[model samples]
Target: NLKDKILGVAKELFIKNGYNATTTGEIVKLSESSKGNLYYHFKTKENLFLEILNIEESKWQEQWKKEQIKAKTNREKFYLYNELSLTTEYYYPLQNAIIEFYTEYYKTNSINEKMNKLENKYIDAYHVIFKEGNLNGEWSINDVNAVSKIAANAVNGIVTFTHEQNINERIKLMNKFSQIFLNGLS
Candidate 1:
């Protein structure tokens, strides 16, 4: 119950202020728990944040299974898969977190090796998506892992570029990239 309560409040804070900006006090206040109780449950903000990120990743995986798995051709899968690749929504922030984790955190601590472990889920699941679609004629890639990596870069570029500009234009850029990816696969 304590852990769940902290998570609930943390999610609210993260949605409102993002991971970097959210604070332990804010979470404690929102959870109506003492600092001791919050720490007893989660120990630290980063651990709690990781749990939030996992929840979000689980959501993405479920959507991918339901939507991308149904595409009947490479073009169809391109269309479907790009929907996930490009959409910023809640996911872009998680992607942002991973990049920050690697470049900054890994550079310093490298303590959280689990960070990459969890991050790999996103890329690996994506590889599986491409592979399955390719087998089903829903996606085509002589090198699915390579293609997925490129696609992942495209997503990173789109979101990072637009993180400062008009978000709609970023989304449009992503849309354009999806079409570009279809061309590559075909």
Candidate 2:
């Protein structure tokens, strides 16, 4: 129960204040747990954040699965993915913190591996959708992996480049980008 409480409080702090700004002491203070207890459950701040990242990834996958079934076609799935991605509520709540964390710990082998694994998961999801789209006659894509990467990059670019824009603007940008991406595949 203490560990769960700590995790919940830390996640809130991380999302609100960001990874660089959040301290383990602050997490302990907010969670009403001692530093020793926090460290006992999570050896380090990095480990705690990493655990939260894994938890967030699992939540995203589970939610995506539920939404994915609603789409009748792979093309619709792609649009749905873009829409969900831009929706901050359903999207990565720790986006800012994760970016800061990545910049700080990217050189570390373990951190790099974890980040790459997350990246590959997104790419692999796109690969599956693209492959299915090909079968459904949505588009005749030859190199699914390449197209998948392109689609992933486009979404990432929209998110990163349009960070200042409102949700509606970001969604529109993604829809336009998705049109270009799908058109190129055909």
Candidate 3:
């Protein structure tokens, strides 16, 4: 229970104040957790943040898998993929923190575990959708992996520069980008 409480407080603090700004002392104070108890569960603050990242990574994958089933066609699934991604960008924006985490902690006990998981999750979705789209006569690609990477990159490229735009504007532009590519594929 103490571990969970500490994590819950840490998650909120990390989101509100960011990784570098948040401290173990704040978490301990907020969660009413002793330093020894915190250390018993997470050896370091880095370990605690990594646990939070892992939790976030799994949450996205589980939700995406469930949404994938509800999509009747690969086209619908692809659109849902973009929507889910943008929704996460709007609400649970973690790209900046994750990038910062990777930058600072690359040498720390495989700090990229969840980052790799997040990438794999998107790559897997792209592969499945593109594979089905090709099979169903919607489109054809010489190499599924190459085309999937392109698809993933297309959205990633658009999303990377969206900081200046409002959420609705970003969504509209992302959809337009997706439409152009999907239409070109067909």
lDDT of each: 0.67, 0.80, 0.74
Return whichever of 2 and 3 wins on TM-score: 2
Q: Residue 55: error of model 2 in Å?
A: 1.1
Candidate 3 — which residues are off by over 4 angstroms?
89-92, 112-114, 146-150, 153-164, 184-186
Model 2 per-residue lDDT at 144: 90
Over 1-186, each residue of candidate 1 has an lDDT whose tens digit, in order, gives 777777777777676566677788888776787777656546567767777777777777777777766876656665566556556355556555555545545654543666766657767765776787777776457888787777767766766556677666766777787787767676
Candidate 1: which stretches are off by over 4 Å?
A: 84-89, 96-104, 107-112, 137-142, 163-171
* TM-score of candidate 3 on Cα atoms, chains taken together: 0.78
Top candidate (lDDT): 2
lDDT of 2: 0.80
In candidate 3, how many clashes are counted?
A: 0
Residue-level lDDT of model 3, residues 31-107, one tens digit each, is: 88668876765877877887877677677767888778888888888877776777762314555555566788778
Q: Which regions of candidate 2 deviate over 4 angstroms?
A: 88-91
Candidate 3 — which pairs collide? none
How much is 178 displaced in model 2, in angstroms?
Answer: 1.1
